[PDB]
Design a binder for this molecule. Sequence first.
Ligand SMILES: Cc1cc2nc3c(=O)[nH]c(=O)nc-3n(C[C@H](O)[C@H](O)[C@H](O)COP(=O)(O)O)c2cc1C
Ligand SMILES: Cc1cc2nc3c(=O)[nH]c(=O)nc-3n(C[C@H](O)[C@H](O)[C@H](O)COP(=O)(O)O)c2cc1C
Lengths: 205, 206
Amino acid sequence: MMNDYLNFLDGRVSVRRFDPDAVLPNDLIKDMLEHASYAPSGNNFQPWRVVVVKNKNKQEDLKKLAALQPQVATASAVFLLFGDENAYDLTWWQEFHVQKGIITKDEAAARAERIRQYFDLHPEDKETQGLRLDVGLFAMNLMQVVRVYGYDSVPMRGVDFDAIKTYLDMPNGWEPILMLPVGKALQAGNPHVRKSVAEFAEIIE
Amino acid sequence: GMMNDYLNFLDGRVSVRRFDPDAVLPNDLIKDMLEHASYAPSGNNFQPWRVVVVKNKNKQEDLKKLAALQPQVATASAVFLLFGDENAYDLTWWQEFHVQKGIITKDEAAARAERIRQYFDLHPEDKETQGLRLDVGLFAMNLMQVVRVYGYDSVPMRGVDFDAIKTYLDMPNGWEPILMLPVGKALQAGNPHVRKSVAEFAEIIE
Ligand SMILES: Cc1cc2nc3c(=O)[nH]c(=O)nc-3n(C[C@H](O)[C@H](O)[C@H](O)COP(=O)(O)O)c2cc1C
Ligand SMILES: Cc1cc2nc3c(=O)[nH]c(=O)nc-3n(C[C@H](O)[C@H](O)[C@H](O)COP(=O)(O)O)c2cc1C
């Protein structure tokens, strides 16, 4: 069963050939997003914002902004993952965590000052560098979750995100992180080729 | 059935901060964990992650002092330090690696390399910390799921002094610290995930 889970995880590869007639229903999209959201993030700020485009005409427009990569138009839905800098809001953080019964109002106020002091020293963790890590965690989770339902994906950045935001009238404070076309594979992805563990990792005892 | 089990497994990834200080994580498994985590995607398959795994309680106690005395650093079976190396975005390597592995032709490599250069020219951040954070973040999440397969748990961390840690371990300067990940056998279960609802962060347009 652990072997089944390992084989499942190993099965994620980029798929770029999707069935243009396959449908990804909104009920499953919502479930996929809910499960993806269980990804960790610094202080549980959950800075991800997602816009799912499920309309072929519009995906064709997006393909024109994505170096004409075909998967953008054949996919059942194109998930656009953004990070919101304004997500690192300490008033929201206190309210949310107290309302959910995780911590008291006093504990939340004290923790919030420590988080402020941290960001004061490490401003990048509440800017694009922070967002890229937090939304990257989310994205990897989403890529495994969509597969539970029989779908596949390909993560993408070789696209004109400035033009995409303008096309979709996106807030200027939302930083584009990744475009993720999701669909039914017509062709399996290729086997993983990677550098060995000995080439990138050191174990010290 | 199958789908329920896979979802339950993914959902089971949770932050664990109470580990069994006597539990041993064998090195064969550490290597297996890193091999499977490596299957994570990265832009152009540059795989810019570098990892140092500290499995030595004496050293972990020193690391705990540099991690605001968070106890999980010292009780864990091993502490996985994940870095990104910006030197990894090297077009010579990229060609050599993909041609030697039979993924693409030599001439196709030179052509692809130039398109990769063009892309980085437009978006230089993607070969710098912004790119590393994303690429190593993908690896990190994959690692966190993989450790669960073997009955272990983890907690991702940045509330530590990465500057002092790099110095304590004699790490290269070109390596950007991304995340500290203690891994061990849970003595206490993680909490159910508390999250904003899908409608609070996502829109579906048809
Ligand atoms: C940040 C990022 C950007 C990527 N950009 C694209 C892209 O624009 N087009 C594409 O076809 N693949 C893109 N990829 C997919 C990678 O090429 C792919 O993950 C890598 O070659 C490893 O293959 P695998 O995903 O099949 O394991 C991107 C991946 C990441 C993580
Ligand atoms: C970048 C990052 C940094 C984090 N820093 C810490 C940390 O220093 N200490 C800690 O106990 N947890 C840390 N966390 C864990 C988060 O608090 C945790 O993921 C979040 O509260 C959600 O809980 P969950 O992982 O159990 O779902 C960090 C997580 C991320 C992604």
